[PDB]
């Protein structure tokens, strides 16, 4: 039931860098250990992959540099909640 | 004289008010050095923004800093402030070109929130002058941020849309505002102007807002947009917050709703459908 996002107005999506949302009480160890095991799954697939940032403290999760190829994968990650690909904020 | 928006705010000015409310601002660089928020606003470590779009773009200082600069001083401004007092905390999520990330937006929201862990102060008000469009993730992120007990307020938005389909302006756990102008009408900004519909919780004064300039040290400028409509109400917030400091996120929304000016707008200016959906509040102080 893990789902993927993005941003409706298309000139405003940033394709290649997603937010990888994990379950409300999904702690560090296991939004790190869910990180790594990206890595190595696409690292089996001939897939390179930069894990950005590892939240904590509001939402679990982190934030992943890699290709789109890799979401049906990353969607099958355990404690995975949902996915969205990054878009672009502006000053008001 | 004083200016059209301090004096609209103004029940038919306080030299020290909202000081026990710490304001996290997340927008362009600052000037932190100008004589109207100078010793007023503490620029954190952190920064988070994506690279500047072009051949070659040049970072001048006295324009990268120009959206932040005013912001900071229509909240606590030494001169033109709403909340005199207030202490503010800024980070860097806007770029040269007022562009962010949400990535960098979430990195800034779960930093204000480690910092008030590590060191905990009064009451925070967070305030966001930005939009993209729609996002589960900056909507939950700012929900999770309003629900730990904080604070947050955004523009609506400069699109002339509905509010709804952007974000952090349809999150609502926020409170989310639209601008008015002089006369206490819609504000129009080139062809667009302020968003509006059922995500909107009040308007404030947008349009003319004398403010702190970075093209010098003690310079003004007017500037429009809901992110000037927003920074009125964390204003206002943080004098009712700093007044009333046990006031609950619920308590504080109904005392902006009862100290509003009320059915002063033309519903008119919004699209048919949008005028009962619209709240026609403008916000004000207390007495």
């Known amino acids: ?92 | 004289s004083i200016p059209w928006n301090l004096e609209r705010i103004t029940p038919p000015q306080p030299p020290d008010g909202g000081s026990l409310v710490e304001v996290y601002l997340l927008d362009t660089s600052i000037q932190s050095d100008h004589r109207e928020i100078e010793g007023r606003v503490m620029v954190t470590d952190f920064e988070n923004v994506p690279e500047e779009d072009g051949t070659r773009f040049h970072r001048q200082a006295s324009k990268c800093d120009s959206h932040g600069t005013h912001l900071a001083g229509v909240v606590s401004g030494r001169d033109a402030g709403v909340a005199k007092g207030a202490s503010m905390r800024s980070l860097r999520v806007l770029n040269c070109q007022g562009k962010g990330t949400v990535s960098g937006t979430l990195i800034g929201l779960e930093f204000i929130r480690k910092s008030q862990l590590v060191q905990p102060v009064g009451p925070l008000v967070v305030l966001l002058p930005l939009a993209g469009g729609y996002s589960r993730v900056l909507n939950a992120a700012c929900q999770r941020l309003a629900r730990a007990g904080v604070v947050l307020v955004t523009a609506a938005g400069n699109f002339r849309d509905d509010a709804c389909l952007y974000s952090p302006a349809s999150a609502p756990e926020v409170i989310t505002v639209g601008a008015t102008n002089a006369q206490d009408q819609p504000v129009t900004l080139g062809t667009l102007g302020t968003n509006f519909g059922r995500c909107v919780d009040l308007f404030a004064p947008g349009e003319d807002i004398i403010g702190a300039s970075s093209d010098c040290s003690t310079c003004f400028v007017s500037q429009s947009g809901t992110s000037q409509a927003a920074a009125h109400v964390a204003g206002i917030a943080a004098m009712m917050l700093s007044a009333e400091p046990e006031l609950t996120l619920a308590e504080l929304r109904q005392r902006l709703i009862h100290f509003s000016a009320k059915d002063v707008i033309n519903e008119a200016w919004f699209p048919e459908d949008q005028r009962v959906l619209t709240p026609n509040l403008v916000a004000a102080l207390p007495p």
């Open chain 1, 1 to 92: 039931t893990a789902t993927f996002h993005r941003c409706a107005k298309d000139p405003w999506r940033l394709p290649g860098t997603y937010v990888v949302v994990l379950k409300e009480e999904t702690h560090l160890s296991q939004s790190e250990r869910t990180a790594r095991r990206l890595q190595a799954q696409a690292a089996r697939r001939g897939y390179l992959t930069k894990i950005l940032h590892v939240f904590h403290g509001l939402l679990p999760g982190f934030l992943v540099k890699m290709s789109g190829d890799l979401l049906e994968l990353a969607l099958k990650l355990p404690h995975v909640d949902y996915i969205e690909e990054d878009s672009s904020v502006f000053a008001q």
